[PDB]
Amino acid sequence: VPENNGILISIKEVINAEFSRDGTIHSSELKGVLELRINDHDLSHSNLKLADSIDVRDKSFQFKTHPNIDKQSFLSTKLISLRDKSKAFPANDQSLGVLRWRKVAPAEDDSLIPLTLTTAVSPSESQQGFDVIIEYESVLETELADVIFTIPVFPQEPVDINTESSTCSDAEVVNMDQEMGTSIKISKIAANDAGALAFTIEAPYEDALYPMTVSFQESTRDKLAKSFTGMAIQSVVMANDHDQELPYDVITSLKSDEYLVQ
Amino acid sequence: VPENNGILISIKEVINAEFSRDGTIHSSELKGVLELRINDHDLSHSNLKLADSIDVRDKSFQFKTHPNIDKQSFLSTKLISLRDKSKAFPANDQSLGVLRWRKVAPAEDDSLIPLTLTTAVSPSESQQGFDVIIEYESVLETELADVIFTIPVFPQEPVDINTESSSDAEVVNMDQEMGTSIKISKIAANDAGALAFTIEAPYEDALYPMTVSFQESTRDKLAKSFTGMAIQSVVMANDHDQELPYDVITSLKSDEYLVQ
């Protein structure tokens, strides 16, 4: 649980993506939520001003405000404010979802995708299973750390990481029980970098190796942080007096969910 | 993720319990799983001997072995072993559920409950809102740390902890349960205590269900679960004289643990 020093705003995005085995993009879906936590009663009569760069009328984002949040102010001035102007936000450090968005992209469209994937598989020789290569390319401006790939098999023989065919970031099997099967973690994917993970794994037939799932999460704590889609806070202001700014912090995050190759 | 030195055995229990506001037990349900992780191929042809103290024929537990685990051996000798004796456990540090159990208890029966609860509520007379008292009594032999009580309201005003009647309790962010959450630092083994605060709500019934959240774990070869599940040894499947190195973690976690 991140610490809240008064106001803490969390901009959380979750990305779903699906790839064919050769890396062709099938679909993607980004969901986002802006959560507000307040633990100081003196800061509870506040409004959030979203960044001027955000187009709040972009219908492809299906912006939806919470029932208690004034939709008309959001749409008019990019302001998050209560619908009843005489009330204040709960201030006992509850996570308050105030705004949500969702966007989808279709086949062959990479606009929502932070990490592209391709796979190559062949029957191995010099063990009993398949030689897999997972190729990846990041378009993020920051590093992804601890990226986990899960293959849905439970082999009788240990996985053999093919260190020479894979990257020179390092790979190792790890326990990861959020996904079913055998999981391999890569330490880092540098900003904007392309790499490969190569291993041999036992499976009864090629199609058993799929869906391969990837699991990753990054966050930044910084007042000026912008989410993957560009969501960001410009300021936080007294609800009465929009010239009076208040202290606050912002965490942004991007997490995979259904991010697979099939 | 706990570190595995070769063999790591996790004994995990989850407890549900429901109380009336006056503390009368309505019901409870305990669910357990024994998970095996193996990360050394040399240790994959292993069998687990459960503690001799476990009655594996107690039907009120509905002990169920994983399809790939030999039921007969479990029943006969309290052994966890593969049904197909020519196979081995997966050994790439995957969590393998090998045994489960489940037990229920009815109204007024505290045998599955680690923490009993009673509540008292009345309008506050010194400030806005309701004065709540939550009384608790542990029957555990170890301390519970960081126990979280959640009240399903979102008050305008800060919660006032009535430090006189509880001292250390504090509001925390806990989004696994909806509402306002207060954490108590410790509940000593076998101790009884109380949490007392004042909170705003529109009417008394809005303060319910109150939910409690707790989780404790221990790492020790000889650790026993809340219901007594434990490991005696780990042994080579082909030679039950040849013991193997291992560790055990036990845990107990609340799930639907409330007063209503």
């Binding site: 439970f154 009788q156 029980d177 079913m180 | 799983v33 998970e35 994983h66 790939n68 593969l82 197909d84 196979k87 081995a88 997966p90 995957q94 969590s95 393998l96 559920g97 489960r100």
Partner: peptide
């Protein structure tokens, strides 16, 4: 977990 195989 409970869907693993041999």
């Amino acid at each position: 977990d409970w869907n693993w195989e041999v």
